[PDB]
Each structure stands twice: as C-alpha cells, then as structure tokens.
Design a binder for this molecule. Sequence first.
Ligand SMILES: [Cl-]
Ligand code: NA
Ligand code: NA
Lengths: 241, 241
Amino acid sequence: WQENKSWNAHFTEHKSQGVVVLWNENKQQGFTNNLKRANQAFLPAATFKIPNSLIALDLGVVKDEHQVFKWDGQTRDIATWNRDHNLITAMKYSVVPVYQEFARQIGEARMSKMLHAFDYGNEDISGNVDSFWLDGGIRISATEQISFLRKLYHNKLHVSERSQRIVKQAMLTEANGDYIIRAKTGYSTRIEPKIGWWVGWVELDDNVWFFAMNMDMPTSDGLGLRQAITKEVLKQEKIIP
Amino acid sequence: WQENKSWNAHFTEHKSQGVVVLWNENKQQGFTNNLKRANQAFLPAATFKIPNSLIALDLGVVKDEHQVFKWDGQTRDIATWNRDHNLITAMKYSVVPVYQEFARQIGEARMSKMLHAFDYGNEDISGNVDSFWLDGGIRISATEQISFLRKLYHNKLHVSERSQRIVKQAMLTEANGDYIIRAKTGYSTRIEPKIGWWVGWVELDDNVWFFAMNMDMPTSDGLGLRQAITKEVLKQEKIIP
Ligand SMILES: [Cl-]
Ligand code: NA
Ligand code: NA
C-alpha cells in the first residue's frame, strides 16, 4: 500500500473531498490519496447491488439476466424506474424497488449467512432486510470493496462460477479498444454523511486495476463527479488515455 | 424477412459493395439490403474465431480466459501479434497463430464433429487442419452467421453454458450508456473475392439486434468501413444514436 497525496488535486479542483483507491493486480500494490479514508466504512447504497445480485442468482431468486421483473405500477421519482427491467437494466439504472423484492425473497437468514460467507464489510444486516444497505447497519470501506471485488474477479466468492460471471457481465459500464470498465455507482442519502460511490475495475490487455472511490455528496449535482474524478486519477496514472 | 435497398447508399458512398443483415430479436424480423448476397456463403476467416474459441474451451484446450499463450518468438507483420496473449486479447487482435495452435490441438475429427453439432455453415472442414477457415472448404452466409449467433446468445449451442459465456465476454467490442456491441471482425484474403466481415449483436435495454455483414475488400486500407458502414445502417434504423 502507498499513499499518493497528489490525487487530492482532482478532488480540490472541484471543491470536493473523498478517497480513490487503486489496486494493481499484477504488482499486488495499492494506492490511495488518503489511507485513513480508504479504510473508513460507510453505507454501500447501490454498490450493494453487486452482492445482492450474486445471492439472488445463486438462490434462484433470479433465474438469469433475461428474466423480466415487471414494474409494480407505483410511479416513483426516477423515470427509468417506472418500467419493466431485467438484471442488466436494474443494475444499470440502480432500480431499488427491483432489488428490494430480491432481498425480501432471499430473506434475512440467507442474506446474513451469505454476507458472512462473502466476508463483506461488517457483515451486518440490521434494519429491514429490504433496506439495510440504505438505512441499516451494514458498513463497508473502500479497501473492503476492493477485497470483495478481487474475489469476484477471480471467481473466488462462495457462490457458483456462473453467478459470478453473470454479475460481472451486469457490471459492464464502458468499453472500447483501450479499456473495459466493470463497475457500480452508489449514492447514500438516508444517513449522514451523504456520499457517492464508484467501485469496480478496469481491464486492460495485460493487467487489471481495481478501484473504489467515495466522496462527500451534499447534493445530487455532484453525482457526475464520481466518474469524472476517478477517470482523472486513472488518466494521470496512465491507466486510460 | 424483408429487403431494404436504401442501405446501399451507405455502401456506394464509399465506392463499396456488400451486405448488411439485421435481426430484430423481439419482433423476430430480419432485414437486409440484398437478399441474395445475405444468403451467399463465403470463407469465414477470423469470424471463425468464435466457434474455434467455443470448441477449444469446451474441450479443455483452453482452461479459461486468462490462460497465457506465449509468443512463439517469430516476428510477424502485425505488431500486436508479437507478444503473449490470452483468449480475450487473441480474439481482440485476431491473432491467427494462437488460433492455429488451438485448431491443431482440437484435431480434425473433433472439429468436424463440433461443427456438425453447431450446424455451422456448410460444416465442411476439408483443407488444412490449421487453416480451413482461411483457405479450405468451409463456407458460411451472413444469415447463417446470424442463426449461429442467436444460438450462442441463448446458450443453446451444444457446448457448456460456461463456454458460451466466456466467448460472449471475449466478443465484447464496445460499450456505453446507449448500447453494447459483442462482435467479431474478419478478413478473407486467400480466395477471391476478398471480403471483410463484421458479425455480432447490439444489446439494447429492451431488445437485441443481431447483425452480419460482409463487403468486398481489395485492400486492408478499407477495413474500417466494416464498422463504419454497419454503424450508418444502425443509425438509420434508430438502433443506435
Ligand atoms: Cl461482458
Ligand atoms: Na468458482
Ligand atoms: Na448460398
């Protein structure tokens, strides 16, 4: 592990505060602009959709990435939510109500057992089984997110290889000739302090760079900063053009 | 099926000739600018990397997408070929020597049997074990490519679901918030007429559009047209922005 304070400039150019954590898989070395924040545990919010997806698939709650989950008919504030979705779109649009139904079906006993198996954050599911990742007791740090992701990347999680592959497919966010990004955004607004998350990895031709970032998010206006800052760090480090 | 000759404009604008075939999965409808050419069988060239990959994986020739195939030390014309590769990179850069090795390991009996199971093209492997797809008897049409691709998308091909999933991952070409493209390029140069191919699918939020195209390609200089012309068709059909 190494601290590289220079990345703070990317946060400060925006009158922002946060942490970005990178892990060079080939070299087995990590980097961050704030080792302490890197280790600070927060509510995962939508980043919980990764483990939630894995558990639902492994248990058969979700058959495959094509099964459609009908809109429940309640008009919510995010337009994209008011439609039918499959696993790929539910993740893409961070569709809470679909994931809430997955959690309810999985149930508290299975959820807790799986999180323990996953070694995920504090492994705590107190609160509602369908909202703990939002207003409950689960907590996870950026380094912890990296550890979880590495296991997923290597198919080492305690679920089927198939489930892991489907989830990794679902995580696809951007791709071109230069790189592939598999990731998940997060936005915690129920319990202070409000924060934004971006976690995942960058696949290159001969390496993979895992990343986990979070930043203070007082308002929604700064949401795009989650990707923008992470990318600036990635550019500075020559990981992406 | 239905013919739409307006697409010819895209080809003519470049002093080019070819065919683009599209299949709307949701509607179960096909479209092409040239029905006859859509059904004409040509050497698959590098598009053969899709079946080749599936077979190698299913038979254990290739253990996973991470296994490294060391450069043989011979300096070839394509710089990207002169390095170690894995299944993802080999597919991405169309690294023939890697695929040739797979082909030799697989052998003629297994290859023929697998192609018969896949219902792939004319199913004829007559020619060199490590080059039939380049200068042998195998032939496949654009419509035939789409038939094959649909099975692959649905995990219906005779081989393991795992094998199909890995190959679809390897096929990843481009992605963003609007669409995902899984595809493979090809350039048949050994037997006239020389042609360029691009086959795959475009994954949308609510549908998938399969595609198969080929065009006359006298020189490698026009290789970029394969993607560019395809994209014009997609834009014209409102599939992509
Ligand atoms: Cl993928
Ligand atoms: Na596994
Ligand atoms: Na024909």
